[PDB]
Symmetry: D2
Subunit: 121 residues, 4 copies
């Protein structure tokens, strides 16, 4: 699914996920969030299963953005964990964890959780 | 915190997290899980905040392992999202999401969640 | 939103959530899962914010099912945490945690996470 | 484990969980958070597996607090999902989801996730 995954994806918020899937299981690219204290593109890296099951299961993958670029630094990082589902209506279905750097007193409220769906349209 | 993060870490399960923190915010290394249907080392990549706050907050970071290596393929990926806390008892405190590739019928049970604490000892 | 919440809801899997919202903030009712090792109705209880904000925000709520009834016992419990959004297309948007009873050796894989959307249709 | 669960528990933050486990699988009681915009006790309700496995597994349970009492209303709700582990050092190990009521524009950041461990000491 290297060809399937590589490209430009969009989630339900209008964020833009630009990724290249490598033969070796690497994901590399950029993320632009349509929401929050973020602007322009941020570096991402991740991994995917380069030899998925052939029984109709999705392709497991994940990636990370640290929210620092040349414009802003939110002192936080999001990881998306999900699966790629190929086909006419290809999708990447994810759950994510957004951790902020906090003091120890605030560490109990360091992490947001949510879910994003990415499509090619 | 490039020097702080780079090195060998261990979690509460006895898993081994070997990481190099790059000047550019990259994390690269290997993960060896002491539990589950996994053996030996797996590639990891991720990102960290290379310019954290100076107010005593932790350093946000995340990384991904896809559970495929030369020995086994679990058709799954884990992402850890957390923060590095420096000091005499340095720690990386994380939450994680483990997504399996599933059929659409099983997608509701695709994702495990948990929490790992890493130390240098 | 006592009148808004009280009633029969359905999620994207076809599960049926029957709830009564009490004046005192209580949720009581039954849950029937369309998926997994579950059959018929299970008791639920929970809580909701009986005096929500008037600024257009949703109404926070949560509930629990333990997966034991007169037919089956899965030795597990799900909690849904979410918000009620009123209007022509009323919705309850949730995230959930499904914890199984495990041995200590298996505790790292005790908890599934996911997300359900409930509608009145 | 009705006798095991019933009583006063404390988590790693110093919060106080007062619960009664009913014969019918009900949890009822009060929660006092040592952190956040909360004061005094809040009502809780939940469920537990009243007929757990006898193979050494923990006892699955969950509960909900809506953060409204006679003193404050945070317009939010937390659900804890976990298991009770009996013995000399009895514990309730949980993960939790804290959902705030939000506008639709802010719904992506409605939910915090974390983990609490409760002990009888």
């Amino acid at each position: 699914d290297q060809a399937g995954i590589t490209g430009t994806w969009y989630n339900q918020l209008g964020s833009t996920f630009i990724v290249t899937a490598g033969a070796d299981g690497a994901l590399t690219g950029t993320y632009e969030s349509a929401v929050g204290n973020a602007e322009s593109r941020y570096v991402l890296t991740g991994r995917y299963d380069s030899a998925p099951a052939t029984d109709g299961s999705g392709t497991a993958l994940g990636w990370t953005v640290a929210w620092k670029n040349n414009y802003r630094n939110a002192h936080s990082a999001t990881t998306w964990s999900g699966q790629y589902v190929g086909g006419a209506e290809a999708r990447i279905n994810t759950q994510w964890l957004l951790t902020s750097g906090t003091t120890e007193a605030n560490a109990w409220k360091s992490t947001l959780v949510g879910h994003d769906t990415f499509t090619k349209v």
